[PDB]
């Protein structure tokens, strides 16, 4: 993005914030951090929000079965878990039927 004027950057930021609004509807702490982050005179808050995201995304890892501190690398582990749980669901359905 180093070679793009500021107006387009503002537009992408606006669209991303619009998406985040829907995305973080459920959470309250992340929602509050986002609501703080839009003050143009406190830029660091935005950065903090990102940290607050990753930080949060780490605590809810459920590290009991996951290890990757980086949430980006935990998508594979969640996919593994969904596959395993689909197998377990099939087994449970058969057991309930019998």
């Amino acid at each position: 993005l180093a070679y793009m004027e500021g107006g387009a950057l503002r537009s992408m930021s606006d669209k991303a914030l619009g998406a985040l609004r829907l995305a973080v509807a459920d959470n309250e702490h992340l929602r509050d951090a986002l609501r703080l982050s839009e003050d143009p005179k406190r830029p660091e808050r935005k950065v903090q929000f990102f940290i607050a995201v990753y930080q949060h995304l780490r605590e809810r890892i459920r590290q009991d079965i996951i290890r990757t501190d980086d949430p980006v690398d935990a998508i594979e582990q969640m996919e593994i878990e969904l596959a395993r749980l689909t197998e377990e669901l099939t087994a449970r359905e058969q057991k309930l039927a019998i």
């Binding site: 596959a83 087994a91 019998i98």
Partner: protein, 247 residues
């Protein structure tokens, strides 16, 4: 300078995408040809993992089929044994011997032979009409005559031997039943054994899930590489503009 600046953003985005894609892999890419050999290695790993996954899946399916075969009403040839059992006022012999001990279970199973799973019908004349109708049934259906509640032991030309039983099934004909393990009769701990089968299949399913996830990961990596090359090759491995622009 303006030409290089115009070229810049495309090159920079390309470099970032390529770096992410390669770092995701253990290897670092340096050429279009190198990307092609990486694709070939990806295909090799995929065509391997799929074979192991299918083999594990076949083993798994066999395990669940075996587990089910022991399920209901009392683990037996319940595919048609059910209808064959309630359609006539009889009771499964295996169920009749459901509570026999694990020790007497092998002896009685060997004694009864292929007739272990038979159905007790004191008349044998209820099945006489329906016999012609039966075209969907186990290739060898077994029936015994007596009181289902208190059936008297089938009279046999039995002859017990060490961990086995000889029997004379018909004139000049002997069947020698070696004491089986984990028999048909005594279907109380056989439920425990099908539980053991479930335990066994747990690891099979775990391994199958790991193989399936590996297959999915390789597929997604290949698709990402394809999309990359679709958007990316035009500027891949080209010189850095930023240094030129600064100079």
């Amino acid at each position: 300078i303006q030409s290089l600046t115009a070229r810049a953003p495309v090159w920079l985005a390309a470099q970032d995408t390529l770096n992410q894609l390669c770092e995701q892999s253990g290897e670092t890419l340096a050429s279009s040809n190198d990307v092609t050999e990486y694709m070939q290695q990806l295909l090799e790993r995929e065509r391997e993992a799929t074979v192991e996954r299918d083999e594990v899946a076949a083993q798994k399916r066999e395990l669940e089929k075996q587990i089910e075969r022991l399920s209901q009403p009392s683990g037996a040839e319940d595919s048609r044994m059910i209808a064959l059992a309630e359609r006539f006022g009889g009771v499964l012999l295996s169920e009749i011997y459901d509570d026999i001990t694990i020790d007497d279970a092998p002896y009685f199973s060997a004694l009864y032979g292929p007739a272990r799973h038979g159905i007790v019908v004191p008349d044998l004349s209820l099945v006489r009409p329906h016999l012609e109708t039966l075209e969907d049934c186990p290739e060898d259906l077994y029936l015994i005559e007596g009181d289902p509640q208190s059936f008297d032991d089938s009279v046999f030309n039995a002859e017990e031997q060490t961990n086995a039983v000889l029997v004379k099934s018909s004139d000049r004909q002997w069947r020698y039943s070696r004491y089986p393990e984990l028999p048909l009769f005594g279907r109380a701990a056989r439920e425990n054994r099908l539980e053991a089968l479930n335990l066994e299949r747990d690891a099979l399913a775990e391994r199958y899930a790991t193989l399936s996830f590996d297959v999915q990961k390789i597929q997604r990596a290949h698709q990402a590489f394809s999309q990359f090359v679709g958007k990316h090759l035009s500027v891949a491995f080209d010189t850095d503009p930023e240094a030129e622009i600064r100079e």
